[PDB]
Design a protein around this ligand. Structure first.
Ligand SMILES: *[C@@H]1O[C@H](CO)[C@@H](O[C@@H]2O[C@H](CO)[C@@H](O[C@@H]3O[C@H](CO[C@H]4O[C@H](CO[C@H]5O[C@H](CO)[C@@H](O)[C@H](O)[C@@H]5O[C@H]5O[C@H](CO)[C@@H](O)[C@H](O)[C@@H]5O)[C@@H](O)[C@H](O[C@H]5O[C@H](CO)[C@@H](O)[C@H](O)[C@@H]5O[C@H]5O[C@H](CO)[C@@H](O)[C@H](O)[C@@H]5O)[C@@H]4O)[C@@H](O)[C@H](O[C@H]4O[C@H](CO)[C@@H](O)[C@H](O)[C@@H]4O)[C@@H]3O)[C@H](O)[C@H]2NC(C)=O)[C@H](O)[C@H]1NC(C)=O
Ligand SMILES: C[C@H](CCC(=O)N[C@@H]1CCN(C(=O)OCc2cc(Cl)cc(Cl)c2)C1)[C@H]1CC[C@H]2[C@@H]3[C@@H](O)C[C@@H]4C[C@H](O)CC[C@]4(C)[C@H]3CC[C@]12C
Ligand SMILES: CCCCCCCC/C=C/CCCCCCCC(=O)OC[C@@H](O)COP(=O)(O)O
Ligand SMILES: [Ca+2]
Ligand code: NA
Ligand code: NA
Ligand SMILES: [Zn+2]
Ligand SMILES: [Zn+2]
Length: 774
C-alpha cells in the first residue's frame, strides 16, 4: 500500500496485498492513496491555448504544451494544432490509406474500439453539422446503414457479444440483471456479484489476443475516470516501447444512452450529448495524428443498441391479468422474465400463468412465451439464467408487476429503433465503402482478422464480412460433405406395403444452387420427381429437405376431393423405412402434411407424386392452417412478386432448444405408438434473383433470400387473431419467425448453396442475411 509515482495506468497487475495504479484500481477500491493526486490531474483542462505554448512544464497540469511534451508523450491532444499550426484531423481531406503508415517498431496496426452506449443508427443522419469527426470516419472509411444488436437489446449482453462473437445464451450475460439457479445468486450493475468470473463465459478478444501473444488489456475502465483522461491514457500507452505497448484498445462512452433515456431518442437535448461524443472522437484522432498513428491505426466506431420512445403511461401491469402477482418475480421493462417468487411454492404452475397472460385485452402490448417457443432468430433460450416464461414487449411499452425517463431499449433486436452503428476506419478497412447491415455477432471474427488472431469458436460466420476489408487473412472453405446419398431405384411391389394407407432435368430445374450437403453421419436417399426433389432420411422417416422451383406464371390448383386422404406408398423406399398411416389414425392430436404442396403440381398426373408417403410430415391441425396457407397462397404470391422462386422446405428437431440439430436420443415426441419423430419447427428457404427482371432459374447476378423457422405448435395461441381467416394472421406469424439460412444450417446439419456462380464469401453473406420486414 505505497505510491503510484512512475506507475500511473501501468499495464501490469500488482498485489495483493500491494496497491494498484491501473485503469481499474478504482473499481476494486485498491488504488494507492496518491492515485487521485498523481494519476488524475485535472488542472487547466484538456486543451492547449496560445498562452501556454512553450510553457515551462508544470507537473500539476492535466496535459502539457511544453516543448518536451512530445518527447514525454503527454501533450494535450490539440497541442500541435494550437502551437505548431497543424490542422485538426477533421479538417484534413480524406486520403485513402493503401498501406499502414506506422512508426518503425510497430509489428501490426493497432486496433482501437470506440463503443458508444445507446447510439441509435438514425443519429448518423444528423450529420457533420453535429458530429463532423464521426461523419468523416463514416464517409472515408467502411460503414453499414446500421448494425443489428443481439436480444435483449441491453448494454451488457451487447457489449460482451461484441467482445466474444457469442449469443448471450452462450456467453452467459443474458441480461443487465440475471438470476442463476445453480449459483443461487443474482447479477446486477449494483453489487459485488458481477465481479465473480463465473458469470462471464466464452473468450473475449483480450483473452484471445493474450493467449496468442498479442498484448491486450481487459476493455473495462473505472467509470470515475473522465473521458478526456481515458483518451490521453490510450495515447500514452501508444507511445510505449514495442515490448510493452498494447495492440488493442477500447474506449466506452456511456453517452448518448444517458440522455436518450431522459429526453427520448428524438429530443432536441440529444444534440449536445452527440457533440460531446464527437469532440471526444476528435481528441482521439488529433492525438493519433500528433503521434503519426492516424494512418496506422484501425478504428471501430460501434454502438451496443439503439433507443426508443418509452413513457411511464405506456406500461402494462401483470396485476390486471394474474389473480396472484405476489407469487411471482418479474424482471420488468422492455422485456419480461417471470419465475416463482419462492422455490417453496409447490402450487406455482407456469401453464396457468401463460394462459392467464395470453390474448386477454384487445390492445395487449406484450406477448407471453415459454422460452423454447420464442422465435429462433433471437437465440434466447439455452441458458439456465433465462427464465422459462418470457414476455416479448411491443416497442414503446413497458411491462411491470403492479402499479405500486422517456427513452428505453431492450426490445426485439429486429425493431428499427434498436438498430445501432458501425464504422471501420484505417489501413485494413475499405475506403469510402458502404456495406450492408450485419449482426454484431460477426465483429469478433473481424477484430481477430484485424489483429492476425485465430478466433475462438463463436457464432459469427467467418468470412461473411470479408467485403469490409482491403486485406483478408481469412479465406473460407466449404465444409466437406459427410454423408453421401443413396439413389434407390424401383424395388418394391405395392403389395409389400402394410402401412394402412389408401388412395383413390429434375436436378437442374429444382436444385438451382445444387444439392445440400449433409454434414453429419446418417443414411438418406435422393428421390427425384417431376415437380420436386428430396433428401429422404431413413432414420427420421421423412425428408431432411425438399426442393422445388415455381415460375412466375405457375398455376395453383386444389387438392381434388377424391385424393383428400390419399397417401401412396413409395416403391423406391422399403416398408421398414416408411411412415404408416395407421399411426396417424391412432394419434388423436396429430395429423399430417406434405413438404412439396400438392397445390402446386405441374399436371394432375404429377400431383400423384405429392401424395407419396415419402413427402409426408407430421402436422398438428392447428399448424396445418398455417402450412396450407403458406403452400396454397403465399408460395405463388412470392413467385409472382420475385419472378419465380426456389423453395427448400424441411423439418427441424430442437427439443433441447440449443439452436442445433437434435440427435435421435434428443427427440422427445413421436407420433403415437410409432417411431415417426415429431418436428419442433418447419423451415423454408425461398431464393430468387436479386435483379427480379431475371427469373430465378436463369439468374446472372446476386441472389435474394428470405427464410423462416415456423414453430410446430398444436394451437395458434401465439396468434390472437387466429379465429379469423388465415389472410388476417398467418403472414404476420411468419414474419415474426423470419430466420437466416445459417440458423437453418445449425438446426439441420445441412449446407446450402454449394453450386452457384458466386464467390463463397458472397454466399456466406447471403446465408447470414435476415429479412426483418422493417
Ligand atoms: C454459438 O457458438 C458457441 C461456441 O462454439 C456454441 O456453443 C458451444 O456448443 C458446444 C456444443 O453444444 C458446447 O460443447 C460442449 O462443451 C462441453 C464443455 O463445456 C465447457 O467447456 C467449453 C469449452 O471452453 C473452451 O472453448 C470455448 C469455445 O467453445 C471458449 O469460448 C472457452 O473460453 C474455452 O476456451 C479454452 O479452450 C479452448 C480449446 O477448447 C482454447 O482454444 C482456448 O484458447 C481456451 O484455453 C465452454 O464453452 C463451456 O462454456 C459453457 O459453460 C460455462 C460453464 O457453465 C458457461 O460459463 C459458458 O457461458 C458456457 O455456457 C454455454 O454452453 C453450455 C453448453 O456447453 C450451455 O449449457 C449453457 O447454457 C451456455 O449456452 C464449458 O465451460 C462438453 O462437455 C460437451 O461435450 C458433450 O458433447 C460431446 C460431443 O463431442 C461429447 O463428446 C460428450 O459426450 C459430451 O456429452 C460439449 O462439447 C460448447 O461448450 C459451447 N460453447 C460456448 C461458448 O457456449 C453454440 O452452440 C453456438 N450456437 C449456435 C446456435 O450455433
Ligand atoms: C462489470 C464491470 C464494469 C462496470 C461498468 O458498468 N463499466 C462500464 C460499462 C462498460 N465500460 C467499459 O469500459 O466498457 C468497455 C468495453 C467495450 C466493449 Cl466494445 C466491450 C466490452 Cl465487454 C467492454 C465501463 C467490470 C469491471 C472489472 C471487470 C472484471 C475484470 O476486472 C476481471 C475479469 C476479466 C474477464 O475477462 C471477465 C471477468 C472479470 C471478473 C471482469 C467482469 C466485469 C467487471 C467486473
Ligand atoms: C487486496 C484487498 C482485497 C480486496 C478487498 C475487498 C474489501 C471488501 C469489500 C468488498 C465490497 C466492494 C469491493 C470490490 C468492488 C468495489 C465496488 C465498487 O467500487 O463499485 C460499486 C459498483 O456497485 C458501482 O456500480 P456502478 O457505478 O453503477 O457501475
Ligand atoms: Ca438441439
Ligand atoms: Na389424427
Ligand atoms: Na388464437
Ligand atoms: Zn447500452
Ligand atoms: Zn440504457
Amino acid at each position: 500500500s505505497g505510491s503510484c509515482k512512475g506507475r500511473c495506468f501501468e499495464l501490469q497487475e500488482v498485489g495483493p496485498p500491494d496497491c494498484r495504479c491501473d485503469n481499474l484500481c478504482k473499481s476494486y477500491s485498491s488504488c494507492c492513496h496518491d492515485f487521485d493526486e498523481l494519476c488524475l490531474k485535472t488542472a487547466r483542462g484538456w486543451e492547449c491555448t496560445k498562452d501556454r505554448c512553450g510553457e515551462v512544464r508544470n507537473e500539476e497540469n492535466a496535459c502539457h504544451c511544453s516543448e518536451d511534451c512530445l518527447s514525454r508523450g503527454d501533450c494535450c491532444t490539440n497541442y500541435q494544432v494550437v502551437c505548431k499550426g497543424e490542422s485538426h484531423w477533421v479538417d484534413d481531406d480524406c486520403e485513402e490509406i493503401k498501406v499502414p503508415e506506422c512508426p518503425a517498431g510497430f509489428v501490426r496496426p493497432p486496433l482501437i474500439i470506440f463503443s458508444v452506449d445507446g447510439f441509435r443508427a438514425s443519429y448518423m443522419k444528423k450529420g457533420s453539422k453535429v458530429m463532423p469527426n464521426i461523419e468523416k470516419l463514416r464517409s472515408c472509411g467502411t460503414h453499414a446503414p446500421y448494425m443489428r444488436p443481439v436480444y435483449p437489446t441491453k448494454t451488457f449482453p451487447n457489449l460482451y457479444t461484441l467482445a466474444t462473437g457469442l449469443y448471450p445464451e452462450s456467453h452467459g450475460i443474458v441480461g443487465n440483471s440475471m438470476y442463476d439457479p445453480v449459483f443461487d445468486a443474482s447479477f446486477h450493475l449494483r453489487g459485488r456479484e458481477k465481479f465473480n468470473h463465473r458469470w462471464w463465459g466464452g473468450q473475449p478478444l483480450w483473452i484471445t489476443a493474450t493467449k496468442q501473444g498479442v498484448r491486450a488489456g481487459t476493455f473495462f475502465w473505472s467509470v470515475s475516470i473522465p473521458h478526456e483522461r481515458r483518451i490521453l491514457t490510450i495515447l500514452q500507452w501508444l507511445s510505449l516501447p514495442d515490448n510493452e505497448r498494447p495492440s488493442v484498445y477500447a474506449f466506452y462512452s456511456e453517452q448518448p444512452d444517458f440522455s436518450g433515456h431522459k429526453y427520448g431518442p428524438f429530443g432536441p437535448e440529444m444534440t449536445n450529448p452527440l457533440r460531446e461524443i464527437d469532440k471526444t472522437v476528435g481528441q482521439l484522432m488529433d492525438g493519433l495524428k500528433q503521434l503519426r498513428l492516424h494512418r496506422c491505426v484501425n478504428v471501430i466506431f460501434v454502438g451496443d443498441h439503439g433507443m426508443e420512445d418509452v413513457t411511464c403511461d405506456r406500461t402494462e401491469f401483470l396485476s390486471n391479468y394474474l389473480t396472484n402477482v405476489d407469487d411471482i418475480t418479474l424482471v420488468p421493462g422492455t422485456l419480461g422474465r417471470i419465475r416463482a417468487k419462492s422455490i417453496n411454492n409447490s402450487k406455482y404452475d407456469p401453464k396457468t400463468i401463460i394462459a392467464a397472460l395470453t390474448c386477454k385485452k384487445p390492445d395487449q402490448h406484450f406477448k407471453p412465451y415459454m422460452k423454447q417457443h420464442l422465435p429462433k432468430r433471437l437465440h434466447y433460450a439455452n441458458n439456465r439464467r433465462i427464465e422459462d416464461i418470457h414476455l416479448l414487449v411491443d416497442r414503446r411499452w413497458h411491462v411491470a408487476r403492479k402499479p405500486l425517463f422517456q427513452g428505453d431499449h431492450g426490445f426485439d433486436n429486429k425493431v428499427n429503433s434498436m438498430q445501432t452503428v458501425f464504422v471501420g476506419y484505417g489501413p485494413t478497412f475499405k475506403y469510402r465503402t458502404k456495406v450492408p447491415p450485419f449482426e454484431n455477432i460477426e465483429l469478433y471474427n473481424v477484430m481477430c482478422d484485424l489483429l492476425g488472431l485465430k478466433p475462438a469458436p463463436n457464432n459469427g460466420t467467418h468470412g461473411s464480412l470479408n467485403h469490409l476489408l482491403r486485406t483478408n487473412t481469412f479465406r473460407p472453405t466449404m465444409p466437406d460433405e459427410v454423408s453421401r446419398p443413396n439413389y434407390p431405384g424401383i424395388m418394391y411391389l405395392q403389395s409389400e406395403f402394410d402401412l394402412g394407407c389408401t388412395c383413390d432435368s429434375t436436378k437442374e430445374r429444382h436444385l438451382l444452387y445444387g444439392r445440400p450437403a449433409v454434414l453429419y453421419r446418417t443414411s438418406y436417399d435422393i428421390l427425384y420427381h417431376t415437380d420436386f426433389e428430396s433428401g429422404y432420411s431413413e432414420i427420421f422417416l421423412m425428408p431432411l429437405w425438399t426442393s422445388y422451383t415455381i415460375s412466375k406464371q405457375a398455376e395453383v390448383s386444389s387438392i381434388p376431393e377424391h385424393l383428400t386422404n390419399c397417401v401412396r406408398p413409395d416403391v423406391r423406399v422399403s416398408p421398414g423405412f416408411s411412415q404408416n398411416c395407421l399411426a396417424y389414425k391412432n394419434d388423436k392430436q396429430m395429423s399430417y402434411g406434405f413438404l412439396f404442396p400438392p397445390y402446386l403440381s405441374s399436371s394432375p398426373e404429377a400431383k400423384y407424386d405429392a401424395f407419396l408417403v415419402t413427402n409426408m410430415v407430421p402436422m398438428y391441425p392447428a399448424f396445418k392452417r398455417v402450412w396450407a396457407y403458406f403452400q396454397r397462397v403465399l408460395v405463388k404470391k412470392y413467385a409472382s412478386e420475385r419472378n419465380g422462386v426456389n423453395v427448400i422446405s424441411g423439418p427441424i428437431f430442437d427439443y433441447n432448444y440449443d439452436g442445433l440439430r437434435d440427435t435421435e436420443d434428443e427427440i422427445k415426441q413421436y407420433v403415437e405408438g410409432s417411431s415417426i419423430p415429431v418436428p419442433t419447427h418447419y423451415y423454408s428457404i425461398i431464393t430468387s434473383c436479386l435483379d427480379f427482371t431475371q427469373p430465378a432459374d436463369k439468374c446472372d447476378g446476386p441472389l435474394s433470400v428470405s427464410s423462416f423457422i415456423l414453430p410446430h405448435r398444436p394451437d395458434n395461441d401465439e396468434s390472437c387473431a387466429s379465429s379469423e381467416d388465415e389472410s388476417k394472421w398467418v403472414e404476420e406469424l411468419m414474419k415474426m419467425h423470419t430466420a437466416r439460412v445459417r440458423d437453418i444450417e445449425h438446426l439441420t446439419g445441412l449446407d446450402f448453396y454449394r453450386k452457384t456462380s458466386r464467390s463463397y464469401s458472397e454466399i456466406l453473406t447471403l446465408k447470414t442475411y435476415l429479412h426483418t420486414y422493417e
